[PDB]
Each structure stands twice: as C-alpha cells, then as structure tokens.
Amino acid sequence: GVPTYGAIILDETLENVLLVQGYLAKSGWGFPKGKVNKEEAPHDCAAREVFEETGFDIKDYICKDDYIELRINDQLARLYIIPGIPKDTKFNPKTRREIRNIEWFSIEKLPCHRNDMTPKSKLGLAPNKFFMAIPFIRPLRDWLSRRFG
Numbered sequence: 001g002v003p004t005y006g007a008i009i010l011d012e013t014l015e016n017v018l019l020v021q022g023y024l025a026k027s028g029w030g031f032p033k034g035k036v037n038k039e040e041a042p043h044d045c046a047a048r049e050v051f052e053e054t055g056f057d058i059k060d061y062i063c064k065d066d067y068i069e070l071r072i073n074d075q076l077a078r079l080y081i082i083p084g085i086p087k088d089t090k091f092n093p094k095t096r097r098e099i100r101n102i103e104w105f106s107i108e109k110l111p112c113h114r115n116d117m118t119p120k121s122k123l124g125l126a127p128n129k130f131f132m133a134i135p136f137i138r139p140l141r142d143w144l145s146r147r148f149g
C-alpha cells in the first residue's frame, strides 16, 4: 500500500481538532491526509495534502518528531501533530470536487471506537460518520497527556 501523510491540527485551548468531510467512499469525517508521490519526502507530502484540503499551510509549523503513525490493513498513515492554530482561521479547500466541508470538533466528544449491535444479537459494528478519524483518537489523547498533561 502507498503510505499516506497529513495532520492533526489543534486549536489554542487543545480542546478541538480540525476534521474534513469528503464524498462517496470518503463521505464521512477524517483528518486531512493523502498518498505520497514518488521521491516526495514525508513532511512535504503532509503539507501538500493539508494545503489542498484546507487551504492552510503547515510547513513552518511541522515538528519532525511530533506525529502519530498507524498501520491499517498493510498501509501506513502518519499524521503530524500541529497545536495552537486559532479557531478563527479561514479554511478553504482547493479541491471542492473532493471536500464537502471543514469543521472543528471537541476531542472529548469524539468516539474512540464504533458501537456494536449486541442489543440486536447481531455481529459487526454500526455505521459511524467518524470512521476514518476513530483509530487516531485514543493515541492522540495519550500523546497530549504525555506532552502537556
């Protein structure tokens, strides 16, 4: 699988994260990210994808060692952590054929797992519009505890 790179952008209070909503197979909410080009460095892919999806340039704010990385079904996703970005920042995608909306969400209200269907004696998980964000939520809360407390 081709690796993906992007960012977890937080506000000045560290309460809120910025999520993007795509279309079709990406119809729900997730962190801004995308696939690396041949010979493109990880930091440069993360800035490129975030700027295309939000209109905000992270290049001068990336810290090389501050990121969460997860391997999901063979494919690696790395999100650089970017705190302190003001909540009144104007965000606008470049690609509106790809991005429906951009919003701030409270970290403590986001799910860190989907709900089962054990009230119905049925297997699997119920739909959740935060599907793409969910795998990063617990590791994020643990990272913010260690770094800031």
Ligand SMILES: CCOc1ccc(NC(=O)c2cnccn2)cc1
Residues within 6 Å of the ligand: 026, 027, 028, 029, 126, 127, 128, 129, 130
């Ligand atoms: C990808 C299209 O957007 C949606 C919209 C709704 C849901 N399904 C839910 O059951 C739901 C209900 N309430 C809270 C959270 N999720 C999943 C994806």
